[PDB]
Every structure is written in C-alpha cells, then in structure tokens.
Amino acid sequence: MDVFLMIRRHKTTIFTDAKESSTVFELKRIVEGILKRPPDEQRLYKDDQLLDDGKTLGECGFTSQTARPQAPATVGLAFRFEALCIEPFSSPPELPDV
Amino acid sequence: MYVKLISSDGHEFIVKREHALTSGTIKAMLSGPGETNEVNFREIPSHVLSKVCMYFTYKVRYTNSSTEIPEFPIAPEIALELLMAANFLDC
Amino acid sequence: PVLRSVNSREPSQVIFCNRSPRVVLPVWLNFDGEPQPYPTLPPGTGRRIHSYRGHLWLFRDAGTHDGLLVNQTELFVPSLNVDGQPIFANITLPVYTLKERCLQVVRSLVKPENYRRLDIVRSLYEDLEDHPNVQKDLERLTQERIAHQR
Amino acid sequence: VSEQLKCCSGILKEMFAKKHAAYAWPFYKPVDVEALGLHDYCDIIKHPMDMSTIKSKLEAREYRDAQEFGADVRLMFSNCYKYNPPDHEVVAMARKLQDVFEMRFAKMPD
C-alpha cells in the first residue's frame, strides 16, 4: 500500500511516495538522492518525534488513510544537529464576502 | 528526474518532472522551442502552489485507476486563489 | 436523433453501482434522444436495474449536474446477458482538471447573480456561468461519434 | 395422471420456445421488484408465480394432477392482469401467451 509524504525543512518541501513496508532509512536515501546529503547527516520527525532508521513508515503511523495523494502527511527534516524548523506556508485571505 | 517550483514568498517545492508536466504552462516553461530544472512563480504564494503540487500527485495517481477515485478536497478559503492559479497553469 | 436508445424489446439485466462520493442521477436517453431523469443513487449504494439492449445511459451529480464516468467512459449501453449474467455499470468520479474542480467549489459557495462580484478575470466569470449541462455534453458526444465512424 | 403431467411439461417447453419469446420473455423468471423499481408489487400480489418456478415444481413432481399445474399458470397471468392497467404493453403480451397455453391445455388427454 503506497504512502504519499511531504518532506519539509525551512522553506523547502519534497513531494514523494513510498511503500508502507518501506523503512525510515530508505526515505533518507531518497532525500540524499535529491538534496545531496548522506543519510547519517539527516534526521526525520513526525510532529516533534524522532524516527528510528530501522522502523517502517507503517510502524511510524504513516498509512494509506493518513498519507494520501490529495492530503499528504508531513515529515520533519534536519541536517548536520540543528533544531527542527519548518517555516509555515502563507495565510489565505479572508473568505471574500459571498 | 525532479524539478523545483518556487512560490512568490520564497518556498521551494521539489516535485517529480513527470508530475509537474501535468501543467501545460510548466511543460512549456521548461521544455524547448526547437531546458531548465527550476521554475519561479512571482504571483503564486506557498498555500496555493503546495495545493497545486498535491493536485499533480493526485492526478498522476488516479488517472490510472478504474474502480473508484476519491474527491480532490478544496477548503473554501483557498478556492478563489486556486482557481486563478489552475487557470494560469492550464491544469 | 443520433445519440438515442434503440426500441429493441430485448431485456438486459444491469447493476448500477455508485462508487462516487456524490449522489448520482442516472439519465436514460429515450427513443427520440430526449434525456429522462431516473431516481437518484445514494453514495456507495448499488442496485439491480431492468434495461434493454441498445439503451443509452449517462450519469450526473444530482445536485450540480457535474458529469460522471461509467466503466471509465461517459455513455453506458447494455449488451445481451451471456448465460443470464448481469452487466455491471461502475459509476465513478473522473479525474477533473484542477480548473473544473475549483469552478465546482466556487459555484457551490457563490450564488449565480454574485459571480460578477468575485474579484477575478472576465474569462473565469464566463467559465463559472457555463454550468455543466446534459444538452451541452450530448452535442459534444454526437460529434465525437461522427469523426469516430468517419 | 403420469401422461397428463407429460403433456404439461410439453406445453411449458413450447411456452419457452423462441417463436413465442417476442411476448413470453416477461414471464420466464420471477418478478424482480428491485430491478423493475416497484414499491407495491408485494402488497398487491400475495402469491408470485412464473414459468421458471413452475418448471422446478414439474421436475420436482410437486403437481399431483394437471389441474394443479394449470392453476399456477393462470395465477402467473392473473398476477400480471391484477397489478397492471389494461392499456399496459405487458397485458397484451400476457394475453398472447395465455392464447398459446389455453389452446394446448384444452387438448389435454382424459
């Protein structure tokens, strides 16, 4: 079963999919392939919660229902280690009258 | 393999090339007349472009389906800005 | 009188299956090509249907008249039940373009007389007022079959 | 009685014949109330009947004489006449099929 993730750090955001049976380490291998940073130099969080490299994405709580294409699940990313800092997206304006 | 979409307010969105080509505008911007990896949008903010990238993954994922697809959700708040973006991007 | 049901009296046992989150309004094209509304199917529900060979069907959102797919096409025409086996008609959402999907949400929130009071380009006004329509789509499908047969 | 029930099978066999299919087809299988979108058939018609059900009772030897078999064939037609107004196409079909049955059933050995 496929899980659709949104890997985030500062003002960067990576849209990628992964198997539920896939491990947290295999996700660091994808981040490396994109942002050119060995896996030992990165950490992955789920709402201020460190993820072990041995654990699978399913065991971390990312499931088909949680991490969907139209509504992907957020994964925190940090380099070096720096404090986890995800800049929030801009605010939508007030619902226009009508 | 991947492409970078940049919003009006800095935010960078790394997205699979095959996903981003869902947009006629993006397809035209980083193809050739007769090629680039980055595309900057001066007038599309984070909260919109993030939703557009979600649409790309949704569109690529469920065009291949044949049994049942889910609704693509749009919060009333984003509806107006996302329309104008969808018009500009031709998707 | 090009897209119409043939008046065969050859029965066809069908199953309509609503696998959309919308309330579905089935539309039978009668023998003159005029569209007839049938009772609506709630979401996730299915039911047995008595129809006939060469009868044209077409499915819509009961509320908004947004087009829906049936076995990944716009039109459903029953075959003859081989060994009395039912013909399945699986009704689903299409993968709407982000544009057509946004129009739906803006239409569902704004009253038609207030479309003009939205701060958007004149080309998005004319796209909002151009409601999904059965008569509109039938014209398209008629010309698609002309080029397909030629 | 054995020879009369052999006739009945022969009558029913002919009612299923392709030459009569043009007007016999509505009465082949039991009335599917969901498929026909009817919300009242079960209130009005207490004892449903059809040629398929009759064929089973014939092979299962549930008809003691030919007069028990005829009663069920007439019930089938009665149900159709009772439920539908006379102008409905199905009534015209029921009559054309009863014309066939009554003709053959009237030449029953005794």
Ligand SMILES: Cc1ncsc1-c1ccc(CNC(=O)[C@@H]2C[C@@H](O)CN2C(=O)[C@@H](NC(=O)C2(F)CC2)C(C)(C)SCCCCCCNC(=O)C[C@@H]2N=C(c3ccc(Cl)cc3)c3c(sc(C)c3C)-n3c(C)nnc32)cc1
């Ligand atoms: C509830 C619902 N929710 C979503 S869709 C739906 C739904 C509701 C009703 C139906 C009923 N089916 C139709 O309306 C079909 C669908 C479409 O293919 C068009 N259609 C027709 O029935 C068309 N008629 C024909 O093609 C023919 F008549 C030329 C052969 C219509 C729309 C032009 S006429 C059908 C509307 C009139 C309904 C009469 C209501 N009465 C009955 O159903 C009584 C029933 N009639 C019939 C009957 C009706 C017509 C014919 Cl010449 C012969 C028998 C009947 C049987 S048994 C059996 C297998 C049938 C078909 N029957 C018996 C015996 N006694 N009564 C009956 C289907 C779906």
